[PDB]
Each structure stands twice: as C-alpha cells, then as structure tokens.
Amino acid sequence: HARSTGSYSLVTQQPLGGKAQFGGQRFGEMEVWALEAYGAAYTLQEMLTVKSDDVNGRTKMYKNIVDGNHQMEPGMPESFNVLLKEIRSLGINIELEDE
C-alpha cells in the first residue's frame, strides 16, 4: 500500500483513505521525540502542518514541485485557528499578537 494524494475532511482537514485510493501512514508521536533528539527543525514542523493539518499550505506546495521549484514556509495550522473560536465560546477571550 502507498498513498500520495487523497481526500480531506472539513473541520478536521486531514489525510484519509477511501476505496480506490490508499491510506496514509499516521506519523505517531512515538516518532516525534526520536527526531527531537537529533535537534532538527524544519523536518519537525512539516509533520504537523502541510503534511496533515495545514490546508492552504498543502495546495500551494503541490504547485511548487511541478515546475521544479521549491515550497515556501507553511502557514497557520487549521486545528489551531479554530481552537481560538472553540475557547472563545467559554466565556474567555483570546487574541493573538506579534512582537
């Protein structure tokens, strides 16, 4: 079995696996700490955003390796920008801020 492209949910926005299409290997947390030990960086944030959660950063990347270019930096995760509203309905206000 091998998967490269497939369908995605709405609120969840994650790689699935239908019938005709295969399924993607879920990068378990057990393989996250083993990577942090090396002291990496970009190869850790990718297995959290574009390669799963991030949606608008997944489509833009697909149009970068087709012409022989390079994909830019991912954006803000979808499971994070919705949490801001999820917590907002709990009588508590949350607001982002730069420097």
Binding site: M76, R88, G91, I92, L96, D98
Partner: protein, 35 residues
C-alpha cells in the same frame, strides 16, 4: 508568516456583542423540504 507571543484576558459582554450580530430565540434548526 509566523507567530510570536499570545495574549489572554477575560471576555466581556461588550466585546462579545461586537462579534455577534443578533440573538437566537427559535430552537428550530433547518427545513427538510427546500433545505
């Protein structure tokens, strides 16, 4: 781009009134006919 620091503070009815546009009173959801 990227994220820096995060600010957290209590929520006031004056602020929640801003985002909101009105109030819901009818428990009824949608219709099965014209959807």
């Amino acid at each position: 781009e990227e994220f820096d620091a995060i600010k957290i503070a209590l929520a006031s009815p004056d602020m929640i009134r801003s985002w909101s546009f009105g109030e819901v009173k009818k428990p009824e959801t949608i219709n099965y006919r014209t959807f």
